[PDB]
Structures are given as structure tokens and as C-alpha cells.
Amino acid sequence: GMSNKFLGTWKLVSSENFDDYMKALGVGLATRKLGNLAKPTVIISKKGDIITTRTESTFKNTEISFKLGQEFEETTADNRKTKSIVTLQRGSLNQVQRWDGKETTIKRKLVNGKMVAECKMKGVVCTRIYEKV
Numbered sequence: 001g002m003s004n005k006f007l008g009t010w011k012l013v014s015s016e017n018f019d020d021y022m023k024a025l026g027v028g029l030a031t032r033k034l035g036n037l038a039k040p041t042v043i044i045s046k047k048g049d050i051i052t053t054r055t056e057s058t059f060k061n062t063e064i065s066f067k068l069g070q071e072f073e074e075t076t077a078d079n080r081k082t083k084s085i086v087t088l089q090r091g092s093l094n095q096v097q098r099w100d101g102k103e104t105t106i107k108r109k110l111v112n113g114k115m116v117a118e119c120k121m122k123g124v125v126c127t128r129i130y131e132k133v
């Protein structure tokens with residue numbers, strides 16, 4: 001299952017290409033400006049087979065709870081209503097969001113104790129690095 005090394009509180013220390021990733025999602029300028037300034041905390045916890053991923057920032061908070069491999073309804077930080085699935089692949093916690101015939105993926109993996117999130121849509125790739133708090 002998911003490594004217990006994912007569990008805990010993570011703080012964003014680096015973000016590369018987030019603006020173009022948000023543009024690809026259809027996020028408007030004012031929102032992108034605040035999104036680029038945000039340095040969120042991400043909290044990953046588990047209760048039984050239910051994993052919760054909570055994101056906290058001054059601008060927006062989000063929270064998803066899911067079982068691996070089972071589709072769930074998600075509301076994203078930019079208020080998309082998606083159908084999402086999280087899978088485990090070679091230690092990587094991989095989230096796919098689908099809405100209106102579109103798709104984006106967020107792959108979270110542990111690298112030397114950091115969590116690295118790779119966000120992909122329409123060939124635009126964003127990398128966000130988090131440190132454990």
C-alpha cells in the first residue's frame with residue numbers, strides 16, 4: 001500500500017511552471033496571480049483504507065478522501081467538479097482528474113525525503129517540491 005512515509009505535514013518549498021499549468025486548466029489571471037503567491041501546506045493522513053489529502057493556504061483550502069483505485073467526486077482548488085482516481089505505481093501516488101472530456105494528472109512521489117508533485121495537462125508539466133514539517 002501507500003508508504004507510511006507519505007503521512008504527515010508537507011510545506012511547499014519550490015514550484016516550477018505552475019502558471020502555465022493553471023493556464024492549461026483554464027484558470028483566470030487574477031486567480032493565477034494569487035495561486036503563484038501561495039505556499040500551501042499539504043497534510044496526508046490515513047484512517048483504515050481511507051486516505052485524506054488536505055491542502056491549506058490563505059487563498060484556498062481543499063480536501064479529498066479516497067480509497068486506492070476507487071473513483072470519487074472531487075472539487076478542486078479552482079472549483080472544477082471532477083471524477084478522480086488515485087492509484088499507486090512504483091511508490092508514486094498518482095491522481096487523475098477528469099471533467100468535461102479533459103484530464104490532468106498529479107503524481108506525488110518521495111525523493112530523498114521530499115515529496116515531489118508533478119502536475120501534467122495537455123503536455124504542460126509543473127513540478128512542486130515539498131519538505132516535511
Ligand SMILES: CCCCCC/C=C\CCCCCCCCCC(=O)O
Nearest residue numbers: 027035038040057060077078117128
Ligand atoms: C495549491 C492549490 C491551493 C492553493 C493555490 C490555489 C490557486 C489556484 C487554484 C488553481 C490551482 C489548482 C491546481 C492545484 C494543484 C496543486 C498540486 C499540488 O498539490 O502541489
